[PDB]
Amino acid sequence: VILLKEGTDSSQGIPQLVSNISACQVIAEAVRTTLGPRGMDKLIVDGRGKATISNDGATILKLLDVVHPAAKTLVDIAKSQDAEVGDGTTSVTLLAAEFLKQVKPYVEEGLHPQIIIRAFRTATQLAVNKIKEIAVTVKKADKVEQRKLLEKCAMTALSSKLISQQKAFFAKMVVDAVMMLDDLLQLKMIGIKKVQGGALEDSQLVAGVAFKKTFSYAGFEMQPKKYH
Amino acid sequence: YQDRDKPAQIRFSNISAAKAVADAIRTSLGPKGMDKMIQDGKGDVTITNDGATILKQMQVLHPAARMLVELSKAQDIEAGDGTTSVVIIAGSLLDSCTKLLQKGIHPTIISESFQKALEKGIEILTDMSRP
Amino acid sequence: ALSIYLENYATSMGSREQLAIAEFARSLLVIPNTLAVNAAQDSTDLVAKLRAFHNEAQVNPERKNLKWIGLDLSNGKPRDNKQAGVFEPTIVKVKSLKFATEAAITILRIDDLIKL
Amino acid sequence: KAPGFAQMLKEGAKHFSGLEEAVYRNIQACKELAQTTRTAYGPNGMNKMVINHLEKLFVTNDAATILRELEVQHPAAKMIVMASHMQEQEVGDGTNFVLVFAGALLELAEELLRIGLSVSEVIEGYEIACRKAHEILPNLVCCSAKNLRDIDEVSSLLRTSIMSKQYGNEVFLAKLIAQACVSIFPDSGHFNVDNIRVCKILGSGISSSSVLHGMVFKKETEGDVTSVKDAKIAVYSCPFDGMITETKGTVLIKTAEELMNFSKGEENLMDAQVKAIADTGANVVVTGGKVADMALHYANKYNIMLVRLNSKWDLRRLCKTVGATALPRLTPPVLEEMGHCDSVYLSEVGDTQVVVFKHEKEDGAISTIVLRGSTDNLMDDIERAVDDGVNTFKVLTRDKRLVPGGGATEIELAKQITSYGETCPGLEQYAIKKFAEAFEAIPRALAENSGVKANEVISKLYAVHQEGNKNVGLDIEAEVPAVKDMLEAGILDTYLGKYWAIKLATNAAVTVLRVDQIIMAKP
Amino acid sequence: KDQDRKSRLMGLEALKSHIMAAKAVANTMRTSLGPNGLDKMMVDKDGDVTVTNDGATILSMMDVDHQIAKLMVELSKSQDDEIGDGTTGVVVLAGALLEEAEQLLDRGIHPIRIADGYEQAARVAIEHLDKISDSVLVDIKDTEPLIQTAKTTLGSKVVNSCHRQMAEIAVNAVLTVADMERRDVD
Amino acid sequence: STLAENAGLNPISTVTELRNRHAQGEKTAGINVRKGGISNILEELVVQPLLVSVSALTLATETVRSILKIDDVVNTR
Amino acid sequence: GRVPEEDLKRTMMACGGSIQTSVNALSADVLGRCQVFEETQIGGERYNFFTGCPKAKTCTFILRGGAEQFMEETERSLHDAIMIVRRAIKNDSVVAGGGAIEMELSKYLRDYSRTIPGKQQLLIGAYAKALEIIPRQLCDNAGFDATNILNKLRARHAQGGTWYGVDINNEDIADNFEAFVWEPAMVRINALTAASEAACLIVSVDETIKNPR
Amino acid sequence: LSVFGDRSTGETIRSQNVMAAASIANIVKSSLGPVGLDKMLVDDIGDVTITNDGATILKLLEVEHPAAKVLCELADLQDKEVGDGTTSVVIIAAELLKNADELVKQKIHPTSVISGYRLACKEAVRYINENLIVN
């Protein structure tokens, strides 16, 4: 009759942490195969039956909206990494679930959670110090122009792809499109449009805005196409 | 098609029993073959990887599966080696026959065809051998 | 001591054997982990303290790094067994590792059971 | 079929028989209340993934927020929760002291009742030990606040209260709250937490926060006016939008030209409405909801400073300070109900413009801490540290007496009370000794939350106290279960925090022990 | 939200389940391939009744609620604008490649590795087709054989009664809107 | 593929690699379990007589042909 | 006419005008400007475009190919190619990608954990093994054998390797620094910090509370 | 297949032999060292032989399982050869199986595990011999 909970579901101790560790691995499995350029795609269907195919880890987590409490922590952390950077959400999501998996058997053996936190806070700072000590600055290495090194980095992602035979042309289109912008660079600014048919090398790079122009109404031999 | 009479169920019954004997003895092939645990009815237990000893201590009851056991004895008398390789080859051919029979090929056509591969097979091994 | 050496030796071979030699290294720690539990002490800390004094012996041979440090059960602290006189025969640790390895090999090869 | 339930005749309530120990059951409801907050005790307290009634996720370790969200239905637990609410009066800390200590008194009382000691004799021992504890607690006073109004002094003592609410960032928060508290202590005999307000703004991190005078509001000034010294501030709850007439006011429009005529008539009316604001000698206006586009230019026409306060608590905050009350009509020229202020201006701090109500002409005894954080849940948890931190020094305006923390007083006060029970003959010694062991639960909470064998902490804390080394507490460290001096480290607790906590905790425990049967009723 | 009753299946059990759906769409159309193909009786939502063997019409009416099967239909929507004829050949070949892939998943091949293998073989096939190709109207604009070849394919449909008159009409139309020299017909 | 599996190798890539070495080379290419990988078996001196491989295909195929010819089994008494 | 709103709004930010629905408010306030406009003949169809706009912080890249999957697969790879070039110019300090830095930290933390007596030894080592997942899944997703690569990769770092990592193209290890497979060091630093801070929030939690609603 | 017995294959057979050897180790795990705890031995009649010696336990320990009997036959080899270290053998062998069984779940073949453990024992005996102290 007189109980304390009366609907208030609550559990504490080691079983709660282990339950959250397993729930976090589910979010990892949802974005485990999408790591890298050649990662497997993921098909997502909304309520209306509309399909969504994408191998981007950030876009996948936005569409899931998992209701588990522990899973929301990773999603909000990964979402913040997407807003601040736009890349690395999968690495953050996988490492977090993997830090939780490796300390899982020690948590079951009676190791306190707070001792585990001192290790991550300690190992993290040592890792961040090792990155800066071993990292290398590359601005004018080998007296090569930046337009050439950036071409190598561009074709690297495009290597052994469907445009591998003509990636020299496509590699220059990336460096050209980025160099056209001002100091404030952003991915959304540089748009892309698709035109079926024709050779791969015929891909054009308009400096301004471009569109198909399906307008085929009357008006020819008038309406001068050039304006100052 | 109706396929009222189903005598093919006995082929799949003999192939499954024949393939079962091969699937067990498969892992024990070679020097690095995984050992197997045999337990006598009295209570004794033993460990071995010799495929010949495992087939004898299997107590095979199916007729088709017994043909693989008697087949392995024929290899021991004739050659004395490759006892385990024979049962593995027969199990895979019958497993391959399960795909051909589903396509509507008769066992007699499959039987006569395998003899032609055996005839050409012996020529392949004999040509590449070292006298 | 073998927990650090075999873990470093595993990185030299590879070829689907780096993990097995590493797990062989981690498996030996059960002995100091079990002796610590029986001595009413924190096994996670004492096992970690042994591997630290033994790992420092591998980094450099300088005398500041302690060497051949054992485990004292009463005081619940590592101690140099050369001074404490906690010695064992060599054939014990050699045969026990050999016989234990042959036993796990004999069981790992068992992938099936047939009853009659 | 007989024999049915025994001692069940009042609405069929669950009446525990003599074998079922009805008193033992009300205690178990209080022990479960402690376990929900025993882990959140100390600087290494564990956070609680609290789910609000609005299905909102919040991760916090504050005791008052846990109980406010945890619907405690058992009455035996409500009494201890009522002591926590009474703990908030006269002091703003020591809440978990009431939960952990009272839970130990009741948990240890079961060991006495199981032996056969009467509940009325257990109460007499706790009342005697509580009276004895109040005599020993002044003798444990190590230091006392100099009252020099020094930020170096106020920030140093404030570090202990900030920790266990927001650990790690106790340096920044101690300096900021010290700068806010020191600026009001000159107002002798009038310090209160209501003056030191808090304004959270989405920002980079906690390090980007600062203190500013006057009632700061995060919403920048919508109008084009930079500064205005007008006293009359007109507050309206109704937003600037299309007017509606309280009478019939039937508006019929058929043609398109008539639509434009009525539209022009509304703009001419709104131009007269904002004209009335300046006619009443008020160049400032506040709005709750949206603000219209044409009315915005009218605010810049007469140079009327436009102000937007979407939060309701922000509006009521001004109603009780300047006096400007919100009226239901849209711009009624009611000059009588307007406010009074010495200075109103905009200021950019941390790359964000915020409205300010500074008191330049008047002396000024109001401040505000502008917190910055990249998460709303994080700033809210930091706000709870400000209340528990500011209220710590609202108590120091009273008798300035500090005692050691980290479980140091709990062992010495237990050691002094245990000796009193050993030499006191009779049956009261059993409950007096257990009153001392109840204090040991607090060091046991700090040790368990830090990952340390609690029995080893009690063994060491008693040895150093046996040698007379008072002011020794638990050294918060994962890999070091030893102890250290709380005086040298600077960890200090408040006297009145322990006084009112030991008092209210004992009354809550005694009030639960005095109850032996819960009975339903009907009006 | 709505995590309850959420679909959850992955690994080989999911790929084989996806392959099982594509095979049903292929086996349904494998019989309707060619002039001797078996027709399909389609009943419309309005109660109508129609019978045909057109691969495109079969897929448009086939409202398969499985998502993997919908992609097979979206593929054929584009094929009608490029190939026109072998709409059943695409679906029948896809079902064959997925059926043979199921034998590879048991051997332990990854799906992405099979994807790379078929892409390599598809290039070998496309390279071989040009070798065994032949021209018709090379270096000359002619209308006689252009009427002949198009007339053969039309003989399978209901235009067989007057198939010859349709082929001459399809030539003058394309010849009118487009020029055989530019070779860019719209 | 069974020998490669027992030797810790990949059953597919081992026979898939050897089928290319046999198209280009000879029968010397085979699995060497002593070293744990593909090697030239002619150099390792790991050989068997011809009768083992010939009698295996001969007797195994005759058993498969015999089992294939079984239409049904009759229980006598 | 018949211009998509995205292209119009892309030209809005490029020209600096405003898309006004009704034609009654059209005036100089909403009208845009440009330097050179010309109608071209890309692939036979006409493509309008304003070049040298006042707020010309945008552009467009028209793709060509034999099908949509040639362009869609090309569309995915170019968007990251823009980010790679966008990253190298911003941050000059970089580290080897493909999990090369993750294996170096695994060597440093693991060798450091041995010198740390206490319970932190097993945990800092556990932190090191957790970094293996980044080069591991790149091998598993690429269809390679993670065992043969990770063992061959972890062995190279011990002998002196610091930039060797996973090569998604060839099933072998490669010097990702010499191969110009780079990533920003500060972006990788923020990944470890957000990872540990995210794991610490879950590890520091011990109980969940739920108001009945 | 029809037979006059029973068969059971798969990875679970390794796990069943792993959990069996792990069980036999836990019977002599807490009794390791000179401060080892005593343990009862309820015979079939009802006698109770209380002792902490690991060798005396395994001689009297009767667990009708094949994998456990392998470790019992293993105990006789160590007792006759040396006469000590039998308890550490059963405990070391149990952890190698519990760890190897985890590798088998990571698609590591037992032959690759058997090869690693053989080389580790060889190098371990080398490092031991290089770090002795003569009598």
Numbering used by the authors:
A (entry chain H): 6 to 233
B (entry chain d): 24 to 154
C (entry chain a): 418 to 533
D (entry chain Q): 7 to 529
E (entry chain E): 18 to 203
F (entry chain d): 463 to 539
G (entry chain H): 312 to 524
H (entry chain a): 5 to 139
Quote the paper.
The eukaryotic chaperonin TRiC/CCT assists the folding of about 10% of cytosolic proteins through an ATP-driven conformational cycle, and the essential cytoskeleton protein tubulin is the obligate substrate of TRiC. It has a double-ring structure, and each ring consists of eight paralogous subunits (denoted as CCT1–CCT8) arranged in a specific order. Each TRiC subunit consists of three domains: the substrate-recognition apical domain (A domain) and the ATP-binding equatorial domain (E domain) linked by the intermediate domain (I domain). Here, we present an ensemble of cryo-EM structures of endogenous human TRiC throughout its ATPase cycle, with three of them revealing endogenously engaged tubulin in different folding stages.
Two cryo-EM maps, including an open-state TRiC with an empty chamber (61.6% of the population), and another open-state TRiC but displaying an extra density in one chamber (38.4% of the population), were determined to resolutions of 3.1 Å and 4.1 Å, respectively. We then denoted the empty chamber open TRiC map as TRiC-NPP. We then built an atomic model for TRiC-NPP. Here, we observed an unstructured tail density centrally located between the two equators in each of the four open-state TRiC structures (TRiC-NPP, S1, S2, and TRiC-ADP).
